[PDB]
Tab-separated table of C-alpha atoms in Angstrom:
chain	number	residue	atom	x	y	z
A	1	UNK	CA	15.903	-5.926	-21.587
A	2	UNK	CA	15.642	-9.529	-22.834
A	3	UNK	CA	18.470	-10.643	-20.483
A	4	UNK	CA	16.756	-9.115	-17.417
A	5	UNK	CA	13.326	-10.493	-18.491
A	6	UNK	CA	14.962	-13.947	-18.762
A	7	UNK	CA	16.455	-13.526	-15.256
A	8	UNK	CA	12.972	-12.560	-13.905
A	9	UNK	CA	11.412	-15.701	-15.496
A	10	UNK	CA	14.196	-17.914	-13.990
A	11	UNK	CA	13.742	-16.494	-10.462
A	12	UNK	CA	9.946	-16.401	-10.521
A	13	UNK	CA	8.520	-18.378	-13.465
A	14	UNK	CA	5.164	-16.769	-14.137
A	15	UNK	CA	2.712	-19.607	-14.738
A	16	UNK	CA	2.105	-19.806	-18.481
A	17	UNK	CA	-1.193	-18.048	-19.045
A	18	UNK	CA	-3.462	-20.486	-20.860
A	19	UNK	CA	-3.468	-18.487	-24.121
A	20	UNK	CA	-6.573	-20.090	-25.635
A	21	UNK	CA	-8.951	-22.838	-24.499
A	22	UNK	CA	-12.498	-23.813	-25.465
A	23	UNK	CA	-15.672	-24.039	-23.357
A	24	UNK	CA	-19.017	-25.765	-23.959
A	25	UNK	CA	-22.123	-24.141	-22.444
A	26	UNK	CA	-24.787	-26.814	-21.855
A	27	UNK	CA	-28.109	-26.871	-19.995
A	28	UNK	CA	-28.628	-29.186	-17.080
A	29	UNK	CA	-30.517	-32.115	-18.747
A	30	UNK	CA	-32.984	-32.098	-15.795
A	31	UNK	CA	-33.882	-28.418	-16.491
A	32	UNK	CA	-34.212	-28.727	-20.318
A	33	UNK	CA	-37.952	-27.749	-20.287
A	34	UNK	CA	-37.521	-24.883	-17.729
A	35	UNK	CA	-34.610	-22.986	-19.335
A	36	UNK	CA	-35.537	-21.150	-22.540
A	37	UNK	CA	-33.126	-21.016	-25.518
A	38	UNK	CA	-29.828	-22.931	-26.105
A	39	UNK	CA	-26.244	-21.744	-26.523
A	40	UNK	CA	-25.649	-22.305	-30.305
A	41	UNK	CA	-21.900	-21.408	-30.439
A	42	UNK	CA	-20.439	-24.508	-28.694
A	43	UNK	CA	-17.470	-24.778	-28.384
A	44	UNK	CA	-16.707	-21.116	-27.538
A	45	UNK	CA	-13.110	-19.777	-27.556
A	46	UNK	CA	-11.800	-18.259	-24.278
A	47	UNK	CA	-10.983	-15.191	-26.449
A	48	UNK	CA	-14.661	-14.761	-27.451
A	49	UNK	CA	-16.517	-11.712	-26.014
A	50	UNK	CA	-18.377	-12.728	-22.822
A	51	UNK	CA	-16.239	-15.885	-22.181
A	52	UNK	CA	-14.526	-14.368	-19.125
A	53	UNK	CA	-12.521	-12.973	-17.459
A	54	UNK	CA	-14.874	-14.193	-14.666
A	55	UNK	CA	-17.408	-17.067	-14.524
A	56	UNK	CA	-19.969	-14.231	-13.977
A	57	UNK	CA	-19.295	-12.998	-17.539
A	58	UNK	CA	-20.191	-16.500	-18.864
A	59	UNK	CA	-23.390	-16.485	-16.727
A	60	UNK	CA	-24.275	-13.026	-18.101
A	61	UNK	CA	-23.561	-14.213	-21.690
A	62	UNK	CA	-25.860	-17.250	-21.195
A	63	UNK	CA	-28.610	-15.008	-19.747
A	64	UNK	CA	-28.233	-12.526	-22.645
A	65	UNK	CA	-27.995	-15.062	-25.513
A	66	UNK	CA	-30.920	-17.157	-24.096
A	67	UNK	CA	-33.104	-14.060	-23.292
A	68	UNK	CA	-33.134	-14.954	-19.542
A	69	UNK	CA	-33.409	-11.233	-18.607
A	70	UNK	CA	-34.798	-11.906	-15.089
A	71	UNK	CA	-31.595	-13.855	-14.180
A	72	UNK	CA	-29.231	-11.183	-15.580
A	73	UNK	CA	-29.549	-8.863	-12.525
A	74	UNK	CA	-29.674	-11.818	-10.056
A	75	UNK	CA	-26.289	-13.531	-9.504
A	76	UNK	CA	-28.015	-16.042	-7.144
A	77	UNK	CA	-30.547	-17.272	-9.740
A	78	UNK	CA	-28.160	-19.304	-11.980
A	79	UNK	CA	-25.496	-21.902	-11.071
A	80	UNK	CA	-22.539	-22.904	-13.249
A	81	UNK	CA	-21.126	-26.430	-12.810
A	82	UNK	CA	-17.707	-27.762	-13.902
A	83	UNK	CA	-16.912	-31.458	-13.221
A	84	UNK	CA	-20.174	-31.713	-11.154
A	85	UNK	CA	-18.928	-28.901	-8.845
A	86	UNK	CA	-20.723	-25.565	-8.441
A	87	UNK	CA	-18.268	-22.786	-9.360
A	88	UNK	CA	-18.365	-19.324	-7.756
A	89	UNK	CA	-19.173	-16.565	-10.270
A	90	UNK	CA	-16.230	-14.518	-8.851
A	91	UNK	CA	-13.628	-17.061	-10.073
A	92	UNK	CA	-11.498	-16.423	-13.217
A	93	UNK	CA	-12.497	-18.743	-16.122
A	94	UNK	CA	-8.802	-19.399	-16.943
A	95	UNK	CA	-8.099	-20.544	-13.341
A	96	UNK	CA	-11.220	-22.778	-13.317
A	97	UNK	CA	-10.043	-24.310	-16.607
A	98	UNK	CA	-6.490	-24.885	-15.282
A	99	UNK	CA	-7.162	-25.894	-11.616
A	100	UNK	CA	-10.563	-27.720	-11.930
A	101	UNK	CA	-10.999	-28.916	-15.546
A	102	UNK	CA	-7.417	-29.766	-16.644
A	103	UNK	CA	-6.944	-32.002	-13.553
A	104	UNK	CA	-9.089	-34.677	-15.317
A	105	UNK	CA	-9.820	-33.476	-18.902
A	106	UNK	CA	-6.579	-31.826	-20.131
A	107	UNK	CA	-6.885	-30.648	-23.788
A	108	UNK	CA	-10.706	-31.071	-23.966
A	109	UNK	CA	-13.190	-28.134	-24.099
A	110	UNK	CA	-14.295	-27.241	-20.568
A	111	UNK	CA	-17.891	-28.418	-20.134
A	112	UNK	CA	-19.864	-25.782	-18.204
A	113	UNK	CA	-23.353	-26.988	-17.229
A	114	UNK	CA	-25.789	-24.174	-16.327
A	115	UNK	CA	-28.986	-24.499	-14.264
A	116	UNK	CA	-31.447	-22.432	-12.238
A	117	UNK	CA	-30.724	-22.564	-8.512
A	118	UNK	CA	-33.169	-24.412	-6.225
A	119	UNK	CA	-35.486	-25.591	-9.063
A	120	UNK	CA	-34.901	-29.329	-8.260
A	121	UNK	CA	-34.227	-28.865	-4.516
A	122	UNK	CA	-31.111	-27.942	-2.540
A	123	UNK	CA	-27.784	-28.278	-4.341
A	124	UNK	CA	-25.868	-31.393	-3.168
A	125	UNK	CA	-22.720	-30.733	-5.220
A	126	UNK	CA	-19.469	-29.350	-3.816
A	127	UNK	CA	-19.238	-25.531	-4.029
A	128	UNK	CA	-15.860	-24.122	-5.144
A	129	UNK	CA	-15.722	-20.570	-3.722
A	130	UNK	CA	-11.922	-20.098	-4.148
A	131	UNK	CA	-9.667	-21.950	-6.658
A	132	UNK	CA	-6.694	-21.028	-4.396
A	133	UNK	CA	-6.012	-23.501	-1.530
A	134	UNK	CA	-8.261	-22.784	1.510
A	135	UNK	CA	-5.065	-23.140	3.626
A	136	UNK	CA	-3.698	-19.616	4.350
A	137	UNK	CA	-0.113	-21.020	4.390
A	138	UNK	CA	2.217	-18.152	3.299
A	139	UNK	CA	4.806	-19.042	0.588
A	140	UNK	CA	8.405	-18.725	1.913
A	141	UNK	CA	9.959	-15.967	-0.277
A	142	UNK	CA	13.435	-17.139	0.882
A	143	UNK	CA	12.449	-20.442	-0.767
A	144	UNK	CA	10.176	-19.103	-3.598
A	145	UNK	CA	12.746	-16.429	-4.661
A	146	UNK	CA	15.830	-18.539	-3.679
A	147	UNK	CA	17.294	-18.291	-7.210
A	148	UNK	CA	17.535	-14.474	-6.791
A	149	UNK	CA	20.332	-15.126	-4.213
A	150	UNK	CA	22.711	-15.772	-7.157
A	151	UNK	CA	22.539	-12.015	-7.971
A	152	UNK	CA	24.516	-11.176	-4.797
A	153	UNK	CA	27.318	-13.667	-5.680
A	154	UNK	CA	27.759	-13.096	-9.451
A	155	UNK	CA	27.883	-9.244	-9.226
A	156	UNK	CA	24.333	-9.141	-10.620
A	157	UNK	CA	23.056	-6.514	-8.133
A	158	UNK	CA	26.027	-4.252	-8.982
A	159	UNK	CA	25.310	-4.708	-12.723
A	160	UNK	CA	21.627	-3.815	-12.132
A	161	UNK	CA	22.517	-0.689	-10.090
A	162	UNK	CA	24.993	0.448	-12.782
A	163	UNK	CA	22.265	-0.095	-15.446
A	164	UNK	CA	19.747	1.890	-13.373
A	165	UNK	CA	22.248	4.755	-12.890
A	166	UNK	CA	22.959	4.701	-16.661
A	167	UNK	CA	19.297	5.465	-17.551
A	168	UNK	CA	19.174	9.256	-18.131
A	169	UNK	CA	16.207	9.358	-20.551
A	170	UNK	CA	13.018	8.091	-18.863
A	171	UNK	CA	11.080	7.826	-22.163
A	172	UNK	CA	13.662	5.633	-23.947
A	173	UNK	CA	14.725	3.840	-20.737
A	174	UNK	CA	11.153	3.099	-19.438
A	175	UNK	CA	11.089	-0.536	-20.602
A	176	UNK	CA	14.546	-1.358	-19.189
A	177	UNK	CA	13.644	0.561	-16.000
A	178	UNK	CA	10.427	-1.478	-15.508
A	179	UNK	CA	12.261	-4.828	-16.013
A	180	UNK	CA	15.161	-3.809	-13.714
A	181	UNK	CA	12.720	-2.738	-10.974
A	182	UNK	CA	10.747	-6.026	-11.420
A	183	UNK	CA	14.062	-7.901	-11.009
A	184	UNK	CA	14.934	-5.751	-7.939
A	185	UNK	CA	11.497	-6.542	-6.403
A	186	UNK	CA	12.403	-10.255	-6.649
A	187	UNK	CA	15.985	-9.722	-5.422
A	188	UNK	CA	14.869	-7.882	-2.218
A	189	UNK	CA	12.726	-10.921	-1.197
A	190	UNK	CA	15.991	-12.775	-0.369
A	191	UNK	CA	18.006	-11.769	2.731
A	192	UNK	CA	21.437	-12.302	1.060
A	193	UNK	CA	20.504	-9.702	-1.589
A	194	UNK	CA	19.128	-7.228	1.001
A	195	UNK	CA	22.385	-7.474	3.027
A	196	UNK	CA	24.442	-6.948	-0.149
A	197	UNK	CA	22.349	-3.887	-1.197
A	198	UNK	CA	22.775	-2.346	2.301
A	199	UNK	CA	26.587	-2.117	1.782
A	200	UNK	CA	27.748	1.493	1.287
A	201	UNK	CA	30.127	0.336	-1.492
A	202	UNK	CA	27.044	-0.486	-3.623
A	203	UNK	CA	25.834	3.158	-3.531
A	204	UNK	CA	22.253	1.731	-3.634
A	205	UNK	CA	20.487	4.680	-1.950
A	206	UNK	CA	21.924	7.324	-4.331
A	207	UNK	CA	21.095	5.198	-7.425
A	208	UNK	CA	17.527	4.570	-6.198
A	209	UNK	CA	17.021	8.280	-5.332
A	210	UNK	CA	18.362	9.212	-8.792
A	211	UNK	CA	15.847	6.789	-10.400
A	212	UNK	CA	13.024	8.143	-8.185
A	213	UNK	CA	13.892	11.736	-9.196
A	214	UNK	CA	13.986	10.737	-12.903
A	215	UNK	CA	10.478	9.167	-12.574
A	216	UNK	CA	9.030	12.138	-10.600
A	217	UNK	CA	10.388	14.689	-13.158
A	218	UNK	CA	9.041	12.586	-16.070
A	219	UNK	CA	5.513	12.477	-14.542
A	220	UNK	CA	5.607	16.250	-13.774
A	221	UNK	CA	6.586	17.037	-17.406
A	222	UNK	CA	4.096	14.552	-18.921
A	223	UNK	CA	1.050	13.184	-17.112
A	224	UNK	CA	0.541	9.415	-17.541
A	225	UNK	CA	4.199	9.036	-18.715
A	226	UNK	CA	4.421	5.962	-16.422
A	227	UNK	CA	6.661	7.889	-13.960
A	228	UNK	CA	4.026	7.354	-11.233
A	229	UNK	CA	4.173	3.516	-11.416
A	230	UNK	CA	8.020	3.598	-11.565
A	231	UNK	CA	8.182	6.003	-8.592
A	232	UNK	CA	5.840	3.719	-6.565
A	233	UNK	CA	8.013	0.632	-7.352
A	234	UNK	CA	11.270	2.482	-6.476
A	235	UNK	CA	9.754	3.719	-3.175
A	236	UNK	CA	8.637	0.139	-2.287
A	237	UNK	CA	12.104	-1.323	-3.040
A	238	UNK	CA	13.770	1.524	-1.092
A	239	UNK	CA	11.501	0.905	1.944
A	240	UNK	CA	12.597	-2.781	2.081
A	241	UNK	CA	16.345	-1.947	1.706
A	242	UNK	CA	16.167	0.888	4.272
A	243	UNK	CA	14.264	-1.386	6.717
A	244	UNK	CA	16.978	-4.105	6.433
A	245	UNK	CA	19.680	-1.405	6.960
A	246	UNK	CA	17.982	-0.308	10.224
A	247	UNK	CA	17.009	-3.809	11.489
A	248	UNK	CA	21.938	13.689	3.102
A	249	UNK	CA	19.879	16.759	4.150
A	250	UNK	CA	19.739	17.942	0.474
A	251	UNK	CA	18.016	14.633	-0.469
A	252	UNK	CA	15.641	15.077	2.519
A	253	UNK	CA	14.767	18.607	1.183
A	254	UNK	CA	14.203	17.179	-2.359
A	255	UNK	CA	11.783	14.632	-0.789
A	256	UNK	CA	9.882	17.468	1.029
A	257	UNK	CA	9.708	19.357	-2.321
A	258	UNK	CA	7.781	16.249	-3.510
A	259	UNK	CA	5.320	16.627	-0.568
A	260	UNK	CA	4.790	20.160	-2.020
A	261	UNK	CA	4.705	18.739	-5.602
A	262	UNK	CA	1.052	18.601	-6.796
A	263	UNK	CA	1.779	15.309	-8.627
A	264	UNK	CA	2.920	13.584	-5.392
A	265	UNK	CA	-0.044	15.164	-3.500
A	266	UNK	CA	-2.495	14.007	-6.245
A	267	UNK	CA	-0.858	10.511	-6.153
A	268	UNK	CA	-1.673	9.178	-2.633
A	269	UNK	CA	0.282	5.955	-3.330
A	270	UNK	CA	3.472	7.868	-4.361
A	271	UNK	CA	2.955	10.299	-1.416
A	272	UNK	CA	2.408	7.343	0.996
A	273	UNK	CA	5.526	5.550	-0.300
A	274	UNK	CA	7.445	8.854	-0.021
A	275	UNK	CA	6.196	9.443	3.566
A	276	UNK	CA	7.377	5.903	4.545
A	277	UNK	CA	10.981	6.434	3.348
A	278	UNK	CA	11.376	10.043	4.706
A	279	UNK	CA	11.961	8.830	8.340
A	280	UNK	CA	14.813	6.493	7.226
A	281	UNK	CA	16.628	9.335	5.403
A	282	UNK	CA	16.619	11.346	8.657
A	283	UNK	CA	18.027	22.734	4.061
A	284	UNK	CA	17.009	21.276	7.474
A	285	UNK	CA	16.785	24.809	8.981
A	286	UNK	CA	14.549	26.014	6.078
A	287	UNK	CA	12.184	22.967	6.218
A	288	UNK	CA	11.786	23.245	10.058
A	289	UNK	CA	10.908	26.961	9.571
A	290	UNK	CA	8.513	25.800	6.776
A	291	UNK	CA	6.648	23.508	9.257
A	292	UNK	CA	6.408	26.343	11.852
A	293	UNK	CA	3.359	28.050	10.158
A	294	UNK	CA	1.685	24.596	10.066
A	295	UNK	CA	1.576	24.984	13.890
A	296	UNK	CA	-1.292	27.563	14.004
A	297	UNK	CA	-3.442	25.318	16.291
A	298	UNK	CA	-5.898	28.096	17.337
A	299	UNK	CA	-6.187	28.996	13.613
A	300	UNK	CA	-6.339	25.235	12.799
A	301	UNK	CA	-9.365	24.978	15.150
A	302	UNK	CA	-10.980	28.049	13.481
A	303	UNK	CA	-10.276	26.890	9.866
A	304	UNK	CA	-7.501	24.958	8.023
A	305	UNK	CA	-7.016	23.847	4.374
A	306	UNK	CA	-6.921	20.107	3.539
A	307	UNK	CA	-3.189	20.726	2.907
A	308	UNK	CA	-2.724	22.328	6.379
A	309	UNK	CA	-4.240	19.110	7.843
A	310	UNK	CA	-2.208	16.833	5.518
A	311	UNK	CA	0.947	18.871	6.310
A	312	UNK	CA	0.265	18.789	10.085
A	313	UNK	CA	-0.311	14.979	9.952
A	314	UNK	CA	2.879	14.573	7.853
A	315	UNK	CA	4.862	16.656	10.385
A	316	UNK	CA	3.586	14.424	13.230
A	317	UNK	CA	4.698	11.327	11.222
A	318	UNK	CA	8.127	12.899	10.458
A	319	UNK	CA	8.635	13.774	14.158
A	320	UNK	CA	7.761	10.166	15.178
A	321	UNK	CA	10.195	8.768	12.525
A	322	UNK	CA	13.301	10.788	13.600
A	323	UNK	CA	15.836	8.138	14.723
A	324	UNK	CA	17.958	8.246	17.877
A	325	UNK	CA	21.284	9.399	16.391
A	326	UNK	CA	23.404	12.606	16.442
A	327	UNK	CA	21.695	14.038	13.326
A	328	UNK	CA	18.209	13.125	14.619
A	329	UNK	CA	19.068	14.915	17.885
A	330	UNK	CA	20.262	18.030	15.956
A	331	UNK	CA	16.975	18.077	13.985
A	332	UNK	CA	14.919	17.801	17.238
A	333	UNK	CA	17.099	20.540	18.817
A	334	UNK	CA	16.368	22.791	15.816
A	335	UNK	CA	12.599	22.086	16.110
A	336	UNK	CA	12.828	22.932	19.849
A	337	UNK	CA	14.820	26.162	19.109
A	338	UNK	CA	12.216	27.232	16.488
A	339	UNK	CA	9.625	27.301	19.350
A	340	UNK	CA	7.264	24.649	17.841
A	341	UNK	CA	7.217	22.598	21.098
A	342	UNK	CA	6.659	25.740	23.222
A	343	UNK	CA	3.789	26.883	20.953
A	344	UNK	CA	2.097	23.451	21.395
A	345	UNK	CA	2.489	23.671	25.220
A	346	UNK	CA	1.175	27.300	25.275
A	347	UNK	CA	-1.929	26.186	23.302
A	348	UNK	CA	-2.612	23.385	25.833
A	349	UNK	CA	-2.080	25.726	28.832
A	350	UNK	CA	-4.450	28.335	27.290
A	351	UNK	CA	-7.294	25.985	26.325
A	352	UNK	CA	-7.283	23.160	28.936
A	353	UNK	CA	-10.370	23.359	31.207
A	354	UNK	CA	-9.942	23.945	34.956
A	355	UNK	CA	-13.180	21.999	35.706
A	356	UNK	CA	-12.658	18.903	37.911
A	357	UNK	CA	-15.582	17.082	36.257
A	358	UNK	CA	-14.176	15.470	33.082
A	359	UNK	CA	-17.754	14.781	31.791
A	360	UNK	CA	-18.568	18.522	31.720
A	361	UNK	CA	-19.504	20.069	28.342
A	362	UNK	CA	-16.422	22.340	28.572
A	363	UNK	CA	-14.209	19.203	28.585
A	364	UNK	CA	-16.121	17.623	25.642
A	365	UNK	CA	-15.666	20.884	23.696
A	366	UNK	CA	-11.924	20.943	24.530
A	367	UNK	CA	-11.426	17.265	23.558
A	368	UNK	CA	-13.160	17.888	20.182
A	369	UNK	CA	-10.616	20.617	19.222
A	370	UNK	CA	-9.177	19.746	15.763
A	371	UNK	CA	-5.552	20.653	16.632
A	372	UNK	CA	-5.415	18.690	19.949
A	373	UNK	CA	-4.790	15.156	18.496
A	374	UNK	CA	-1.983	16.561	16.300
A	375	UNK	CA	-0.389	18.462	19.219
A	376	UNK	CA	-0.262	15.284	21.369
A	377	UNK	CA	1.126	13.191	18.458
A	378	UNK	CA	3.701	15.890	17.572
A	379	UNK	CA	4.841	16.327	21.206
A	380	UNK	CA	5.191	12.515	21.565
A	381	UNK	CA	7.254	12.206	18.360
A	382	UNK	CA	9.568	15.083	19.440
A	383	UNK	CA	9.846	13.840	23.066
A	384	UNK	CA	10.926	10.236	22.241
A	385	UNK	CA	14.683	9.912	22.967
A	386	UNK	CA	15.105	13.737	23.169
A	387	UNK	CA	15.977	15.013	26.705
A	388	UNK	CA	15.639	18.721	25.777
A	389	UNK	CA	12.009	18.243	24.655
A	390	UNK	CA	11.238	15.893	27.588
A	391	UNK	CA	12.492	18.481	30.137
A	392	UNK	CA	10.532	21.340	28.479
A	393	UNK	CA	7.244	19.354	28.546
A	394	UNK	CA	8.054	17.974	32.040
A	395	UNK	CA	8.461	21.496	33.552
A	396	UNK	CA	4.772	22.540	33.927
A	397	UNK	CA	2.671	20.315	31.625
A	398	UNK	CA	2.610	16.987	33.618
A	399	UNK	CA	-0.527	17.842	35.734
A	400	UNK	CA	-2.456	18.789	32.568
A	401	UNK	CA	-1.281	15.725	30.581
A	402	UNK	CA	-2.179	13.518	33.576
A	403	UNK	CA	-5.738	14.951	33.511
A	404	UNK	CA	-5.913	14.329	29.747
A	405	UNK	CA	-4.702	10.674	30.001
A	406	UNK	CA	-7.744	9.855	32.235
A	407	UNK	CA	-10.325	11.088	29.690
A	408	UNK	CA	-12.121	8.846	27.221
A	409	UNK	CA	-13.230	10.584	24.014
A	410	UNK	CA	-14.233	9.530	20.497
A	411	UNK	CA	-10.989	11.243	19.283
A	412	UNK	CA	-8.873	8.991	21.605
A	413	UNK	CA	-7.304	12.060	23.338
A	414	UNK	CA	-6.736	10.151	26.610
A	415	UNK	CA	-4.748	7.430	24.801
A	416	UNK	CA	-2.690	10.086	22.938
A	417	UNK	CA	-1.911	11.899	26.228
A	418	UNK	CA	-0.933	8.572	27.899
A	419	UNK	CA	1.379	7.758	24.953
A	420	UNK	CA	3.020	11.210	25.388
A	421	UNK	CA	3.452	10.630	29.145
A	422	UNK	CA	5.036	7.230	28.403
A	423	UNK	CA	7.582	8.896	26.054
A	424	UNK	CA	8.331	11.465	28.818
A	425	UNK	CA	9.095	8.612	31.322
A	426	UNK	CA	12.436	8.107	29.490
A	427	UNK	CA	13.676	11.174	31.435
């Protein structure tokens, strides 16, 4: 653990948190007669209750200790000044100390002058709203994390993967697992490390999926085990590695079991991360049959459970994420053979209005059907780069889709129909 912590601190030196500093809380000398009370505890330690984490907490402490109750609920009524600059109450006291005070008065207690706003006229002092540079310049990770590039050359990534694969007990391994994943999050910032991790010889995907499964099982057995945070980190690292790689079916089924898992459902972040990696990984027959009941559109319009909706949205996202390769084609062929595409076309043919006036109430009522957005998204996802699906939709549905693409609705049905027609133009 200590070796990997030391490697993290070499790659990305966390700025030394200012462990303890002192502050003095003084009245504006020009408001001495207007402000009741005085702060008696000068200098105050940064570790003292009410001295942070925000400048607002100091303002609230001054209002409380000086009995200025009317200013306690009003964040606009009191100003805090450091080095004759007005400091935003949203800023961290430790950052104000480091970035504003220590620039001129390093090692002295930070003098905070407090005053009532507008009592002597308009403030003429500079207002510091953000301690961070106003410039939105983005730090170059390839330069910021440049030292992580050594891990590709020294066999460091291979050592880290072997260490990750060696962790069989989540409870004992948690601390090592957290440090290794922190180090991986720095390593994936650098292109040389991403390209090394993409090599099949590294077995990166299987090790990461093993670590994900270990974290998911640990959180299912014991709530708040920390498996959730580990699973989220693994899913984020996997997304980056799988994206670089693109720039088995049993594992896909294990991932869908997680969509069913209440833990993953209750954890939107883990579910989101999981739903982002599922496309890249694309048994299959069983899961396609499992998504077939989720295609009760008429029933969906009548009534559907939050899960039915979530599952129908997830199936639309899966269908859109199926890549153009032999296995992706076989999965789309299986979905076509299971009749899911035909059932979506039969629903549209049954419910589409014959009225020529698109503003008619019958059209509004058709466009507001709950299943219709999901049908158009699903059909698009299945049609992209899949001639069998394109031909089936292109047989009889073009005149109806071409009516739909012309409609504006609050559900965006016209735009969804146009996007489906654009996917069908591949054929």
